[PDB]
Design a protein around this ligand. Sequence first.
Ligand SMILES: C[C@H](C(=O)N1CCC[C@H](C(N)=O)C1)c1cncc(F)c1
Ligand SMILES: [Zn+2]
Length: 139
Amino acid sequence: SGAIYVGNYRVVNRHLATHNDWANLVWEDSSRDLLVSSTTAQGCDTIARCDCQTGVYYCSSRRKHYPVSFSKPSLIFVEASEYYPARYQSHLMLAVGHSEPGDCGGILRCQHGVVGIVSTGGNGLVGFADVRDLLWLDE
Ligand SMILES: C[C@H](C(=O)N1CCC[C@H](C(N)=O)C1)c1cncc(F)c1
Ligand SMILES: [Zn+2]
């Protein structure tokens, strides 16, 4: 679990969104596993606007942060689950690192700010849904 709080927005994995998230829906994209809902309290996370491929992510299953090199956002195959059929997930970045069910939502950050959130894993890999292209989060 986990979320990004920026301005009057909350960014979460679409498959983990709550009833409150859907009742205050701003935008969602099943192909990216992202949902953005509106908030009453002001968020103070900063979003990165860059092409970094190195950063640090929070891994809940280890209660630790790990440094990673990660790929450029791209269309990557994701296996079937109770939330989605087998499909290509867009804007996804892979890294070699530990992740297991429960880790979705952990933030990936670089020196510029928040890059994205854990969305996939398995096999000594971890996948992050990028948010750097969502320029409207800042306004
Ligand atoms: C199996 C699971 C996963 O990648 N999912 C399930 C939940 C929906 C995900 C999606 N983006 O469609 C795909 C997982 C395995 N290891 C680490 C994780 F953080 C997660
Ligand atoms: Zn950066």
